[PDB]
Each structure stands twice: as C-alpha cells, then as structure tokens.
Amino acid sequence: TGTYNNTGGFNDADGSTIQPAPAVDHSEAELRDATDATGNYLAAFQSGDIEAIVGAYIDAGVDGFDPSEEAIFKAFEAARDEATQQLAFSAETITKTRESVAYALKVDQEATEAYLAYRNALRGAATSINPLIDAANAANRTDGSEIEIYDNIFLASDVFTDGPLLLPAYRELVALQTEVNEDLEWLGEFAIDNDADNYVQRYHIPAVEALKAEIDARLEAIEPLRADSAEKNRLAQKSDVLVRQLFLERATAQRDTLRIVEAIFATATRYVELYESDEDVNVEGKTLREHYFALFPTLFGAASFNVGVLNTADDAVIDYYLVWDTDLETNDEDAAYAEEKREFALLTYAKIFINGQWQEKVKYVQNLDDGARAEAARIEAERLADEAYRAEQLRIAQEAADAQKAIADALAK
Amino acid sequence: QPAPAVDHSEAELRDATDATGNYLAAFQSGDIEAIVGAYIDAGVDGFDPS
C-alpha cells in the first residue's frame, strides 16, 4: 500500500521503510551526478521567486491559453506527479550513498589491520636479529677494514614507534643480508690470516652462519605480509568516506525538501479540484475546500526552513570535494567519521519533531476528507441491504402463505 | 510484598544501588546530547534516516 495518499504506515515510495546496505563501491562521481540530477529540479524552488516557480514547474499549455479551471487542475496534477517521481528517485539515492559509505569503511579497516600485522612482524624480526649480530661482532679478530664492525639494525627509521615508516627498515635488512653474504665469502680465503693484529679464529664462522640463517628464515616469512600491506594500503587510498557522508546528508535534505514540495502541489491540486463539487461538504463551520486553503502559511515556513538547511548542505559539497581537511593524517582513522556521524544522527533526531507539526495538519485535513467520503456510502449500502432483506422476507412469506392455501385446497378436496 | 527479617549486607545494598545509579548518570546530567548518545543506539555504519 503506497501512493501520494495512503493509510498503510511506512512507505517505500517516500523513503521511510527499512533497507539493507551491503558494502558496494559506488564512486563519488556517481554520487555527485545522481545528486545534481535532482538539485537542478530544486533551483527554482530554492530561489523562492513565485514567478520562476510557476514558469518552471507549471506547463502553459496550448498556444491559446485556456482560463478554465480544468486545465489549471490538469497542470497542477502533472506537476504533482513529477514531484512524486523526483521523490521516488531521491529515495534510492540514500541507499546508494549508504552502500558507498559501508564499502569505504571496510576497505581502510582491512588496510589498517594488514599494516598492523606487518609492523608486528617487523618488530619481531628486529627483536630476534640483534643478539646474534652482537655475538658475531664480539667474535671478530680482523682489522675491521674489509670485514667491518656491524651496527644495530634500523639506525634511522625507528620501528618501535606506533606509526612509523616501514620501507627503509626492510631495505636496511636487505642491505645487511647482502653485506653478510659478501663478508662470508672472504672467510674461505687462504691468506686471510695475515698477522697477530688481524686474523680469524675458530668461532667466527659458526656465528656468521647462524646470523645468515636467521636473516634468511626471517625474510621468507616477512615477504608476504609486506606484499599484502602494500597492496591493501594502495587500495584504501582510492576512496574517501567523508565526501560520501556529505553526499548522504545532501540527499537526505533533498528528500526532506521534496516531501514538502509534493505536499504543496497536492494541496493546490485538491483545492482546485473541489471547485463547485458535490463532495465539498461542510464541517466545523467551514467548507471542505476552505480547510485546504489554510495549510499554505505553515508550509511556506516549513519549506523555508528546509531550504535553509538544504542551502548549507549543497554549499558544503562543492567546497570540499577534493581538498585537505577531508583526507587526514593517515590512511585509516575513525576519530573524524564518528563525530560527523554523531552530529548527523543528532540533526536527524531533532528534525523528526519539527516536520511533524505540518504533517499532523495535513493528516487532519486529509482525514476529514476521506472520513466524509467513506461515510457517504454506508447509508446507501445499508439501505440497499435492508431493501433486499425486506423484499426477500415478503416474498418468502407470500410463497409460504400460498403453499398453506395450496395444502388447504388440496386436503379440502 | 512481605519483608521477613533476612540479613542482606550493606555492601550488597551499595552494589545493587550503584548497578542502577550508573544508568541514570546521563539522565541526571541533563544534557540532551549525552542522553541521545547513551540511551539511543546509532545502528548500522551507514546511518539510516528512515
């Protein structure tokens, strides 16, 4: 049950029912295009000039302008139908934006998980390597010219920080492995034992071999985590979640404005329709057509408030499409999404107690209307039923009396 | 409700009362933002405005 007028509660034709939001990547350009496809419809309404509104949303008609009320009613009905369709599209825009936001959250969640795993692996390798380096350095008797004195790993890029860079550390580890493999081959020479001031001993080779084996065992496990971290950090940089939140806010404001636009058009259509009509009954000391005319002053303020909100909602997107303060210090952060979500939810909660003021008046007038229309059928229905019942009762009684006369004449014979 | 003489320790009273007094901290503060943040669930990551 769903129409411009309905008695079935929440409706999907307006954007009030529940809808799932799987993580599906809808590009921000798609959001911008879909939102601008509707924002062009509201330029005349947001301007506020009545002449522009009547020129844009109302059709002039045949070259010879017909001033009869029927053409005016038809034009208003067409405008109302167009507004209804625009509202139907703005409904689906919301779900599109929500799915985009969900995907944008999932990607950088996975990216930061992978980064943490890779950093932990690097920290473990750093913990494991250094003691063997010290042990091998302690067991050296050469002059230190070709077989140099080793230095502690990660001398520049401090890995123990929470969010440091991690490529220079890997390159330093690779360079250390290369240096170890280079210095290992000179241990196989024949004239390395030059003199007492520089020579080799028995325990240098086992230490060097153990260090090389540990490095080779660590790198083999380090590699896949580095690859996954790089791949996932590159992917999460191709989507921002803040602009999608802004688009969601803008589309919600657009739907809110389209609601009152449709309400105004429907009110005008119904007011024009009830001209000199049989259904224009009188209630509460006034005519039914009179009740509709009183709705405009409140709508002209509620729509003003909605347009004031939508103007800021529109201006926010244009100035913050691709610029700093929308992307932040690192690839994954929820300290900014949470605050904006909180503010948006608070604004959504607050606005549900404002539109209801005019919603209840519209519901009151509409309720008067369908109550009168539906009550002006039950008398006729019951009258027809009672007439049929009485006719059937009389017919049955008459035929029974005829049957009694029949048996009378039969057994009297 | 009846009330037979049964010894419930004052520490039990304090714990049972504080188990409820934590619920009313946001309401007793009086700030509407704290109330809506504490007693109302935000929902799915994509905030549904329906």
Side-chain angles (χ1 to χ4, degrees):
Chain A
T1 302
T3 316
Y4 73 98
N5 71 286
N6 44 320
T7 65
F10 301 109
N11 54 341
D12 42 357
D14 175 47
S16 69
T17 190
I18 197 72
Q19 290 291 349
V24 178
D25 187 21
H26 287 123
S27 174
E28 37 166 48
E30 290 198 31
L31 311 181
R32 194 183 57 180
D33 291 342
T35 283
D36 282 359
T38 300
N40 283 335
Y41 188 82
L42 298 177
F45 197 71
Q46 285 174 229
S47 46
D49 287 346
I50 176 64
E51 51 285 30
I53 290 159
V54 300
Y57 305 101
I58 319 182
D59 186 14
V62 172
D63 313 278
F65 182 70
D66 186 352
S68 61
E69 279 76 19
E70 194 159 45
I72 321 288
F73 157 67
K74 291 297 184 76
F76 282 135
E77 181 179 60
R80 184 202 72 195
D81 283 4
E82 181 62 30
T84 291
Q85 289 207 324
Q86 294 262 329
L87 182 82
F89 169 85
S90 185
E92 210 83 9
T93 298
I94 288 324
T95 304
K96 156 183 283 214
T97 324
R98 286 176 65 235
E99 296 176 0
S100 192
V101 167
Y103 182 90
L105 286 179
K106 196 188 83 84
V107 287
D108 52 346
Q109 158 187 313
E110 281 195 52
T112 194
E113 167 199 272
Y115 167 75
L116 285 200
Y118 171 44
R119 188 204 64 184
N120 284 356
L122 213 72
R123 278 184 173 173
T127 282
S128 158
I129 281 301
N130 216 28
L132 306 177
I133 273 183
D134 256 320
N137 192 357
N140 187 34
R141 305 217 183 217
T142 65
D143 196 25
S145 56
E146 255 285 326
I147 299 178
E148 291 131 284
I149 287 294
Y150 286 22
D151 280 322
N152 304 281
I153 58 179
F154 309 157
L155 201 43
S157 57
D158 198 347
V159 56
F160 290 110
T161 319
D162 200 35
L165 282 162
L166 256 75
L167 191 66
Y170 173 87
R171 282 197 165 159
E172 201 56 10
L173 183 59
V174 152
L176 182 74
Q177 188 203 46
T178 298
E179 172 164 51
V180 157
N181 265 2
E182 162 84 345
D183 288 2
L184 189 142
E185 281 295 70
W186 290 48
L187 304 179
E189 284 304 322
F190 200 87
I192 179 57
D193 287 292
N194 180 283
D195 79 86
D197 287 352
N198 50 90
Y199 64 110
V200 293
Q201 70 195 357
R202 307 186 286 274
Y203 304 116
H204 206 327
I205 282 157
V208 174
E209 183 175 336
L211 172 60
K212 157 258 197 199
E214 192 65 15
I215 291 185
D216 291 2
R218 285 270 77 83
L219 277 164
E220 192 270 335
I222 277 174
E223 283 303 319
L225 308 185
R226 179 177 156 273
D228 276 6
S229 168
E231 169 175 315
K232 291 184 180 195
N233 273 2
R234 274 200 302 258
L235 175 55
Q237 267 280 13
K238 297 191 299 182
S239 52
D240 298 355
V241 75
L242 297 196
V243 300
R244 304 168 185 225
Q245 170 70 24
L246 294 180
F247 277 117
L248 177 56
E249 300 179 5
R250 198 193 192 201
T252 51
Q254 284 184 351
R255 180 203 64 171
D256 290 357
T257 301
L258 261 62
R259 269 169 171 174
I260 188 153
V261 153
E262 181 188 65
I264 282 172
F265 286 166
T267 302
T269 281
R270 183 54 164 175
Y271 170 86
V272 173
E273 155 77 317
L274 280 173
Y275 169 90
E276 192 158 344
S277 191
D278 186 28
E279 319 278 38
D280 186 22
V281 198
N282 44 343
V283 292
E284 204 179 307
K286 281 175 163 186
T287 33
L288 181 55
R289 191 156 167 250
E290 174 37 68
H291 282 305
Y292 282 106
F293 183 83
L295 266 40
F296 296 119
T298 88
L299 296 167
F300 294 162
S304 186
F305 170 70
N306 289 16
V307 156
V309 152
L310 182 54
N311 268 10
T312 305
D314 278 341
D315 189 21
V317 172
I318 304 301
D319 205 4
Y320 298 136
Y321 193 63
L322 192 69
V323 78
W324 187 246
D325 308 303
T326 325
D327 194 349
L328 279 201
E329 291 285 359
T330 207
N331 192 229
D332 178 279
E333 35 76 47
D334 292 35
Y337 171 62
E339 184 160 0
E340 300 300 316
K341 178 174 184 172
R342 174 179 66 81
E343 300 191 3
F344 178 55
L346 183 73
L347 248 66
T348 289
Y349 288 137
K351 274 212 321 203
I352 207 170
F353 295 117
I354 296 181
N355 294 357
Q357 299 186 342
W358 66 259
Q359 284 160 10
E360 288 313 313
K361 298 173 182 173
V362 173
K363 175 62 165 177
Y364 189 42
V365 192
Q366 173 194 350
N367 239 331
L368 271 193
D369 194 326
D370 37 359
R373 183 182 328 113
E375 82 165 68
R378 177 180 61 255
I379 315 97
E380 287 73 26
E382 288 175 6
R383 179 173 66 75
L384 264 306
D386 292 349
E387 286 190 53
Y389 173 66
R390 285 178 175 186
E392 286 285 73
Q393 270 280 1
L394 297 202
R395 190 215 83 221
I396 294 160
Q398 175 53 83
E399 67 186 310
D402 279 9
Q404 303 215 326
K405 293 186 154 112
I407 39 184
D409 293 346
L411 50 98
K413 192 168 66 70
Chain B
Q1 290 291 349
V6 178
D7 187 21
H8 287 123
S9 174
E10 37 166 48
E12 290 198 31
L13 311 181
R14 194 183 57 180
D15 291 342
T17 283
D18 282 359
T20 300
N22 283 335
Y23 188 82
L24 298 177
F27 197 71
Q28 285 174 229
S29 46
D31 287 346
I32 176 64
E33 51 285 30
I35 290 159
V36 300
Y39 305 101
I40 319 182
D41 186 14
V44 172
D45 313 278
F47 182 70
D48 186 352
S50 61

